[PDB]
């Protein structure tokens, strides 16, 4: 039986482009084409891992500190880690230190050092230093030992996760997304957060925290993907939040990639118009950018959210020719690509792709 040639068009499913961006399919399947201590610099970020009795109590104090609008400038990691330790790992810090997630973080220069504190009076005791900013230490010491918060570590984390999906868009779009999502979860009877948390003041505090702190974002993403069973109401929210945040700030370039990929009866390949000499330079840079992205594996889809290096090179605007081919193919199927606009200079390439597609549809 000879070849039954069939044209199926672009990979609008998004499956193939996802595998390419997460390193599960090598880029050579579609495309073609050591740093030393004396040459490079690695910034180590030491994160104290405080083992403590009454981890619940300390977590309540941490929550109440955030509720009071306390701004942990760059000493938030230790306290935020205790929240994640208490909720996700239920106290077991040693199991966490063995995770593949910690190994990945050690790639980012993170160094987790355990520090045993038999008993700590308050949060001021968990930030020892003779030189650092003392405004926080005095503030944390000024915090009352009174229990005031209505929530727990789980709710704080699930609430924070709501900021992930639209974090990269801006403060207005993010907060509005949080508000809508809170209503969805509340109406469906999944979770109900404290009233005071939904105030503009409190939401702004959590927004500034999420936007500046890499670790809390990563740990939520870690929890959302690698939690396999025993899901709380909180775990469910977190998993849903992380799922929605997938490829946030990368959706446009991803659809461009989808439409420059062509599927036939033989398999998937790059669009012929993308294989011309005129565009080979753009494809080379694009492959290099995807390669840098794919090294992050299962964390690649949150690359723009986590502000990983090189992700700026994935803005579709940098690839007008590929965008043109992508839109050219899209328009042939009566479809359109959101956020993609081809200038007059590339319309000829755009029309060529359109005419090419409507030709192949036999």
Author numbering: -13 to 19, 28 to 356
Which sentences did the original study use to describe this structure?
The ebolavirus nucleoprotein (NP) is the most abundant protein in infected cells and is essential for viral transcription and replication; thus, it represents an attractive target for therapeutic intervention. Ebolaviruses are filamentous enveloped viruses that contain a negative-sense RNA genome of ∼19 kb. These single-stranded RNAs are covered by multiple copies of nucleoprotein (NP) and are associated with an RNA-dependent RNA polymerase (L), a phosphoprotein polymerase cofactor (VP35), and a transcription activator (VP30). In nonsegmented, negative-sense (NNS) RNA viruses, premature polymerization of the NP and nonspecific binding of cellular RNA is prevented by binding of the newly synthesized NP to the phosphoprotein (P). This interaction builds a complex designated N0-P. Formation of this N0-P complex has been proposed to be key to providing monomeric and RNA-free NPs as a substrate for encapsidation of the viral RNA genome and the formation of the NC.
The capacity of many NNS viruses to prevent premature NP polymerization via the N-terminal domain of the phosphoprotein prompted us to express and purify the chaperone domain of SUDV VP35(1-49) fused to the SUDV NPcore region (residues 34 to 367). Purification of this heterodimer complex allowed us to report the crystal structure of SUDV VP35-NPcore to 2.3-Å resolution. Here, we present the structure of SUDV NP in complex with the amino-terminal portion of the phosphoprotein VP35 at 2.3 Å. This structure captures VP35 chaperoning SUDV NP in a monomeric and RNA-free state. The structure revealed the characteristic bi-lobed configuration expected of the filovirus NP with an RNA-binding cleft in between. The SUDV NPcore contains two major domains, an N-lobe (residues 34 to 340) and a C-lobe (residues 341 to 367), both of which are predominantly α-helical. In this interaction, residues H10 to P12 of VP35 form a beta hairpin (β1), which is stabilized through main-chain hydrogen bonds by a longer beta sheet formed by β4 and β5 of NP. The medial part of VP35, residues S15 to L22, adopts an extended helical conformation (α1) located near the interface defined by the N- and C-lobes of NP. However, the comparison of these structures also revealed two previously unknown interactions between SUDV VP35 and NP: a hydrogen bond (VP35:R5-NP:D275) and a structured beta strand (β1) that complements a beta loop in NP formed by β4 and β5. Importantly, replacement of the amino acid residues involved in the beta strand interaction (VP35:H10G/G11P/P12G) resulted in a dramatic decrease in the dissociation constant (KD of ∼1.34 × 10−5 M). This result suggests that the newly visualized beta sheet interaction is essential for maintaining high-affinity binding between SUDV NP and VP35. NP is maintained in a monomeric and RNA-free state as VP35 occupies this hydrophobic pocket.
